[PDB]
RNA sequence: CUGUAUAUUAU
C-alpha cells in the first residue's frame, strides 16, 4: 500500500488546563475531582493519558494512589507502556516526580513492575542526577528500590555514578546514608570498591564514623566485607577490609570514646570470624593501659564490656591484671581501679561482665585457664565483701552479690 | 543505682 506518516498534534496550551484545581493544596485537575479533593469516578485510566495529566495526578495523593491501585502489572499491556512512556518522555518531569512527596510512590510501583527494557531508561534518567536524588527524602527511596530491583550491571552503573562525589556529605546525610547501605548490602564488592578507596583516608573515615548516620554506613561496609567465611584464598575483600580497618585501628582510641563510633568498634570485637585480628589490635592499641579511664565513660564502657566478653584469654589476662594490679593507688583515697569501678554508674557494668567472663571461663578446656579465672573471680569477691554494706544500698551491688552467689572453685 | 544510636517520605 501507500506510506502514511501520522504526526502527533501539538496540544500545547490544553496541557495547562490541567493547572486548574479544586483547592490549592490538591494538584488534581478539576475535571477529575469530587470537589472534596477525592478522585472522581468514570475517570478510567485512559482519560489520564488523553489529557496529559499524569504529572497532575501524580502530584496529588489521591491521584497517585489511583495510578498505583490501577497500574497494569503485565509489561505487554498498552496502558502500562503508554503510562511509562508519559513518565519517561521528559527527564526533568521524571526527576521532579522522583523528587515529589507523592510522586515517588508511582516511580516505585513502576520499578516493582519493570522489565529490563524499562530498567535501562530508568537507570539512565536516575544516573543523570543521582547524587541529589540520593540527598532527597522522597527520591532516596526510589534510588534504594532501584538498587534492590535493577539488574546488577544497571545498579553497578548507578553506584559508580557516585564515584568522585562528596561521599562524606552523602554518608553523613539523613537520607543518602541508607542508599549507600543498600548499595553495600545488595551489590557485589566491585560495584562499590571506590567507597573502600574513599574511607582509606583517615579524615574521611573519622568524620563519617563519628556521625549519627555515617557510623552505620562504615559498620554495614565492614559487616559485608567480613561476611566471607572462606573463599578461594583470594584475599580480596581481606585486602580491602584491611585498608579500612587500618584507619579504624589507627584512630581506635578516639573512635572508641565516642557517641556513635563506639558501636563500630564493638561490632569488630563482636565479629569474631575474619575480624578477630582487628579485635585483637583494637584491644592491644586503644584499650590496654586505658581500661579504668574508658570504663568510667558513658560510651566506652560498653566497648570494655564487649572486649572482656569476646577477647581471647591471652588478652583477657592482660585486661584483668591492668584492673587488679595495673594502676597506682589514689594518693588520698588509696583506691584500686576495682574500688573505683565497683561504685561507678558505668564501671559497675564492666565489673559484672568481668564476673561473667570468669564464670564462663571456669568451664574451659585448660585447667590453668580455669584456675586463673577462679583466682580473678576470688579477687572480685574479696573486694565485694570488703565493700558489701555499701553495695547492698545499690541495684548494681545487689546484682554483683547475686552474681558471686554459690560459685565454684 | 544503675548507662549509648539507627527516616512513621502520602499536603
Chain centroid offset of residue A287 CA? 26
Q: Which nucleotides of B are covered by protein (CB under 7 A)?
A: 1-7, 9-11
How far are the Cα atoms of A157, A179, A357 from residue A99, in angstroms, in the given order?
A: 20, 15, 52
CB of A178 within 7 Å of some strand B atom: yes
Torsion angles phi and psi, residue A227, rounded to 5: -75, 75
Give the span between the Cα atoms of A212 and A215, in whole angstroms: 6
Give the span between the Cα atoms of A175 and A130, in whole angstroms: 13
- Dihedral (C-alpha) A205, A312, A372, A355: value to the nearest 10 degrees? 60
8 Å CB contact between A177 and A216: yes
Nearest residue, CA→C1' of B4: A299
Q: How far is the CA of A310 from the C1' of B4 (A)?
A: 19
Nearest residue, CA→C1' of B11: A25
Torsion angles phi and psi, residue A9, rounded to 5: -80, 150
Give the span between the Cα atoms of A230 and A273, in whole angstroms: 10
8 Å CB contact between A61 and A54: no
Give the span between the Cα atoms of A25 and A40, in whole angstroms: 17
Q: Residues 214-233, chain A: which have Cβ under 7 A from strand B? A: 215-216
Secondary structure of chain A as H, E, C letters: CCCCCCCCCCCCHHHHHHHCECCCCCCCEHHHECCCCCECCCCCCHHHHHCCCHHHHHCCHHHHHHHHHCCCCCCCCHHHHHHHHHHHCCHHHHHHHHCCCCHHHHHHHHHHCCCHHHHHHHHHHHHHCHHHHHHCHHHHHHHHHHHHHCCHHHHHHHHHHCCCCCHHHHHHCCCHHHHHHHHHHHCCHHHHHHHHHHCCCHHHHHHHHCCCCHHHHHHHHHHHHHCCCCCCCCCHHHHHHHHHHHHHHHCHHHHHCCCCHHHHHHHHHHHCCCCHHHHHHHHHHHHCCCHHHHHCCCCHHHHHHHHHHHCCHHHHHHHHHHHHHCCCCCCCCCCCHHHHHHCCCCHHHHHHHHHHHHHHHCCCCCHHHHHHHHHHHHHHHHHHHHCHHHHHCCHHHHHHHHHCCCCCC
- Quick one: cell of A182? 543498600
Give the span between the Cα atoms of A287 and A307, in whole angstroms: 9
Torsion angles phi and psi, residue A293, rounded to 5: -65, -50
How far are the Cα atoms of A35, A148, A197, A315 from residue A100, in angstroms, in the given order?
A: 23, 20, 33, 54
Q: How far is the CA of A372 from the C1' of B7 (A)?
A: 49
Q: Residues 66-125, chain A: which have Cβ under 7 A from strand B? A: 68, 101-102, 104-105, 108
- Rg of chain A over CA atoms, in angstroms? 30
CB of A212 within 7 Å of some strand B atom: yes
Amino acid at each position: 500500500a501507500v506510506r502514511l506518516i501520522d504526526l502527533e498534534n501539538n496540544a500545547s496550551f490544553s496541557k495547562s488546563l490541567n493547572s486548574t484545581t479544586r483547592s490549592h493544596k490538591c494538584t488534581l485537575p478539576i475535571w477529575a475531582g469530587d470537589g472534596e479533593g477525592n478522585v472522581s469516578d468514570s475517570v478510567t485510566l485512559q482519560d489520564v493519558l488523553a489529557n496529559d495529566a499524569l504529572v497532575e495526578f501524580a502530584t496529588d495523593k489521591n491521584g497517585c494512589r489511583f495510578l498505583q491501585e490501577h497500574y497494569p502489572t503485565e509489561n505487554d499491556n498498552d496502558v502500562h507502556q503508554k503510562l511509562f512512556r508519559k513518565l519517561v518522555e521528559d527527564r526533568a518531569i521524571f526527576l521532579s516526580l522522583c523528587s515529589n512527596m507523592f510522586g515517588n510512590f508511582f516511580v516505585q510501583r513502576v520499578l516493582e513492575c519493570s522489565n529490563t527494557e524499562e530498567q535501562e531508561i530508568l537507570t539512565e534518567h536516575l544516573a543523570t542526577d543521582l547524587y541529589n536524588l540520593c540527598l532527597d527524602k522522597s527520591a532516596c527511596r526510589v534510588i534504594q528500590l532501584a538498587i534492590q530491583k535493577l539488574d546488577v550491571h544497571l545498579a553497578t552503573r548507578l553506584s559508580l555514578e557516585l564515584r568522585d562525589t562528596h561521599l562524606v556529605r552523602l554518608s553523613i546525610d539523613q537520607n543518602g546514608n541508607h542508599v549507600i547501605q543498600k548499595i553495600v548490602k545488595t551489590l557485589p564488592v566491585s560495584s562499590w570498591t571506590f567507597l573502600v578507596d574513599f574511607f582509606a583516608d583517615d579524615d574521611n573515615l573519622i568524620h563519617v564514623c563519628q556521625d549519627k548516620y555515617g557510623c552505620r554506613v562504615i559498620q554495614s561496609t565492614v559487616e559485608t566485607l567480613s561476611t566471607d567465611q572462606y573463599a578461594q584464598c583470594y584475599q580480596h575483600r581481606v585486602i580491602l577490609l584491611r585498608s579500612l580497618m587500618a584507619g579504624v585501628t589507627r584512630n581506635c582510641t578516639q573512635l572508641a570514646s565516642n557517641e556513635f563510633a563506639n558501636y563500630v568498634v564493638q561490632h569488630v570485637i563482636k565479629c569474631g570470624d575474619a575480624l578477630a585480628v582487628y579485635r585483637d589490635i583494637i584491644i592491644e592499641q586503644c584499650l590496654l593501659q586505658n581500661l579504668l579511664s574508658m570504663s568510667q565513660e558513658k560510651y566506652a564502657s560498653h566497648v570494655v564490656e564487649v572486649a572482656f566478653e569476646c577477647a581471647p584469654y591471652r588478652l583477657v589476662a592482660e585486661m584483668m591484671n591492668e584492673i587488679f594490679e595495673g594502676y597506682i593507688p589514689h594518693p588520698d583515697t588509696n583506691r584500686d581501679a576495682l574500688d573505683i569501678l565497683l561504685f561507678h554508674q558505668y564501671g559497675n557494668y564492666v565489673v559484672q561482665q568481668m564476673i561473667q567472663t570468669c564464670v564462663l571461663g571456669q568451664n574451659a578446656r585448660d585447667q590453668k585457664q580455669s584456675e586463673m579465672y577462679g583466682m580473678w573471680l576470688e579477687k572480685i569477691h574479696g573486694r565485694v565483701m570488703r565493700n558489701a554494706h555499701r553495695l547492698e544500698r545499690f541495684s548494681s551491688g545487689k546484682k554483683i552479690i547475686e552474681a558471686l552467689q554459690s560459685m565454684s572453685l
